């Protein structure tokens, strides 16, 4: 079951005195939480955003964040003073865990400075990434003094995280299994050459993301299929496009095939010409 938790954060600092730190949270592919720098609280985006957690357990966390944000923003400001960093700044954090079957889990807490890794939290302390500049060692010293923050983080990764996802998993049960059937059509983009044609197969509106689209000749697979990106719809579904550069005289017989979980045995089969 590929359902990891991703607690994500974006901190800005345009100069000495302008900052926004907006965040969010993903459970697999779905957005569960939304944390705007306007809000005191983390907004819950689902009827099941609180796992099995009580309101007071959730309050305990709501507080830890509200402190973390404000503390963070001043600390970064001081590191800039301490490490001589020029002030167009961009910090990010990726924190969370996934729960494997059996007993336990693996967790993570990575932070990044101007889109490059600088440090992760490993076990009981902060650790600098291999590629990281030297001034990181200095920040990492200053961080590893703070035993309370260090232990809080350790508790949040080993303890809270997997208790939370386990709750999220079973209290989100009916929505995580959920199925939305994709719809598909055919079009005709710019022809890649003189006598050729570009066959175009669109597919949109499927919630379980893992999908399978391939152009096929005589019901059996064919090689020139060129798939696109799996892009997001407004209503938290997905859209895939797939193109084939064929000669005009053998567009006849070709077929776009769609394999998705919402469809059982039967698959979606579309034939050319039917644009």
């Amino acid at each position, epitope marked *: 079951r590929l359902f990891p938790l991703r607690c994500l954060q974006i901190s800005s600092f345009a100069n000495s005195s302008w900052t926004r730190t907006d965040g969010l949270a993903w459970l697999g592919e779905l957005q569960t939480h939304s944390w705007s720098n306007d809000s005191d609280t983390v907004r819950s985006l689902k009827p099941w955003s609180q796992g099995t957690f009580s309101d007071q357990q959730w309050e305990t966390l709501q507080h830890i964040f509200r*402190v973390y944000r404000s*503390s963070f923003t001043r*600390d970064v400001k*001081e590191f800039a*003073k*301490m490490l*001589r960093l020029s002030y167009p700044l961009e910090l990010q954090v990726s924190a969370g865990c996934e729960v494997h079957p059996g007993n336990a889990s693996n967790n993570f807490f990575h932070v990044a400075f101007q889109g490059k890794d600088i440090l992760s939290f490993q076990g009981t302390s902060w650790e600098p990434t291999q590629e990281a500049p030297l001034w990181v060692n200095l920040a990492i010293q*200053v*961080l590893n*003094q*703070d*035993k*309370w*923050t260090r232990e809080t983080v350790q508790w949040l990764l080993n303890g809270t995280c997997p208790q939370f996802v386990s709750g999220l998993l079973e209290s989100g049960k009916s929505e995580l299994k959920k199925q939305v059937k994709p719809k598909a059509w055919l079009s005709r983009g710019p022809s890649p050459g003189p006598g050729r044609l570009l066959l175009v197969c669109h597919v949109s509106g499927f919630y379980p993301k893992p999908v399978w689209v391939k152009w096929m000749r005589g019901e059996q697979e064919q090689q020139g299929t060129q798939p696109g990106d799996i892009l997001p719809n407004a209503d938290e579904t997905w859209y895939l496009r797939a193109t084939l550069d064929v000669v005009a005289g053998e567009a006849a017989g070709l077929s776009c095939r769609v394999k998705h979980s919402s469809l059982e045995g039967q698959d979606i089969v579309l034939y050319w010409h039917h644009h």
Partner: T-cell receptor
Amino acid sequence: ADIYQTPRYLVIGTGKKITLECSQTMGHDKMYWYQQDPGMELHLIHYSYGVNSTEKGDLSSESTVSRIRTEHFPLTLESARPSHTSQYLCASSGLRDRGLYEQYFGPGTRLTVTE
Amino acid sequence: NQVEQSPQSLIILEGKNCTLQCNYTVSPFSNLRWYKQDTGRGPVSLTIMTFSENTKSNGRYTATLDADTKQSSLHITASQLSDSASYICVVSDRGSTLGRLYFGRGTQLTVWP
């Protein structure tokens, strides 16, 4: 062992330059400068994270500090006026044992600026 | 100020006990420290306690902490003449050199023979 200051007392004429010496062997990185008027609380004026770093504090004074060697944190006062007559205290934090960074203070310099 | 001390000044006879009070409003609170400032000298640190710990025993001086009620007492046992000093109460809003220190304006203790 220890942190140091020179001189214990200093009397200077209103107009001349002022150097206040502070030495620290402990290898401490973070260092403070404090001012204290007879009776009143301590006001932090300057602080250094070590290395090559010098920052202003919660009091907006006239002095400048520099930190070109770990061991040395000299406070320099350019103008020198009656308003500068105080006691001036050097300090440094840095690990001694268990974990929390204790703060260690100098013996201080009592300045007096006369007309 | 965010760090308040009581009493302002007190006078005790040598070889008697006494207790000094400290209350704070510093948020976030990490650690409370007691400083002994003998006249015309530098402060000497005596005790450092965290939100976590509730009592630190440094020889004759013993500190108390209640992060619940944001209150810390210091307690001198079998006092002597060398105790007569200003006692500063300091609070840190971080558990590393990255935080600020908020100083009290001190309690003035006098010990008489």
